[PDB]
Design an enzyme around this catalytic site. Sequence first.
Site, PDB file in Angstrom:
ATOM      1  N   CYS C  32       4.210  27.351 -23.788  1.00 14.10           N
ATOM      2  CA  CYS C  32       3.510  26.372 -22.986  1.00 14.10           C
ATOM      3  C   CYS C  32       3.949  25.090 -23.870  1.00 14.10           C
ATOM      4  O   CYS C  32       3.879  24.754 -24.853  1.00 14.10           O
ATOM      5  CB  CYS C  32       2.134  26.534 -23.077  1.00 14.10           C
ATOM      6  N   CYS C  35       1.244  23.209 -25.215  1.00 14.24           N
ATOM      7  CA  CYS C  35       0.851  23.685 -26.613  1.00 14.24           C
ATOM      8  C   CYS C  35       1.896  23.428 -27.740  1.00 14.24           C
ATOM      9  O   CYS C  35       1.335  23.069 -28.947  1.00 14.24           O
ATOM     10  CB  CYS C  35       0.757  25.324 -26.369  1.00 14.24           C
TER      11      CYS C  35
END
Lengths: 135, 130, 107
Positions: C32, C35
């Site tokens: 991600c 992330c």
Amino acid sequence: MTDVDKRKIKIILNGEMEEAELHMITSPNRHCCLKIFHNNNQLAESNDTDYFSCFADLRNQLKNIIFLCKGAKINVYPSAMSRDMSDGIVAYETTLGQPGLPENQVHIFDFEDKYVDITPEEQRKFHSQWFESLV
Amino acid sequence: DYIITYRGDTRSFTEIFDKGFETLGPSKDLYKHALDNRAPPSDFVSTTIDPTKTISFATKYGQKSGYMYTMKTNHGIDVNKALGARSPFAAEAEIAMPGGVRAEDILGARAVNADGEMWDYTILNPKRYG
Amino acid sequence: SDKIIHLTDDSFDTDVLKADGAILVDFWAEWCGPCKMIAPILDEIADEYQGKLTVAKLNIDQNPGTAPKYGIRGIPTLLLFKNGEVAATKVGALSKGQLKEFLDANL
């Protein structure tokens, strides 16, 4: 879930440029349906797995019509990825001896009056010549 | 050997997280897939390693909102490496996935509106995280 | 960095729910972009707020069991725990300044 998009294009019929309406019905499992109308009258329909293929089937049924769209231009063709990811709505305007670039991308139903008075077969044959010109 | 690739689509994540990505036909010929994956219907799903290359396709040329899907697989073929200088759209950084992508291997989805702006969070596939 | 707690599904109740002081839990995954983007920002916050806050990370790929229990359906998600209860929630990427704003307003 089924998506329905619409789009107005220009077509030439009997030397008379006229406005047509497209309906794009995207149903589950890559079923694309392309309907074309003039003044609420359905002129034709085609069913295929992407809209570039639908468009080609549509122009083959209506051979007496020039479609003033990028998708009908002799040197426009989707990549595998653009066919797959955008259901063939996005395609590339190619040039002999040059690979397709992001800036060459087009919407197959955007307006185009040049090099569009050609059949789907002539378009597809140019695309093979383009592909082979890259070596 | 597993790699992360991306795929754009207007289709909603509820439909995609359930059904995965299926191929058009049985042809396992990678060169013919690059020439025209509809003739013959090719047995590969296109993905890219560059997430920015999905945006144009996910939005159908800036016309619609859509999604960028993230996948993890280990059977992809690097199209630029396989075709070399014959690669027709090498800027796409395509990884072709033979046989398709199982619903289970799609990790998440990120919304993108028509002007190309993506949401700042990734929605998780419940098949893996629910 | 050396101050971030590296959680697992097994260690969650012990290191979060039974922890002393405020715990910031980052639900995250290596695939991600948002992330990974907030990752080194959390290392900065973990040092600046030491003694006021504990920063912990739960990687949902290695630890798939915890996020569903807190209705977490997207990442990155930051949950602020105080004495075993969720005291605040922040979903999505943010800058170091935006993160410090969220923290100062909840501590």
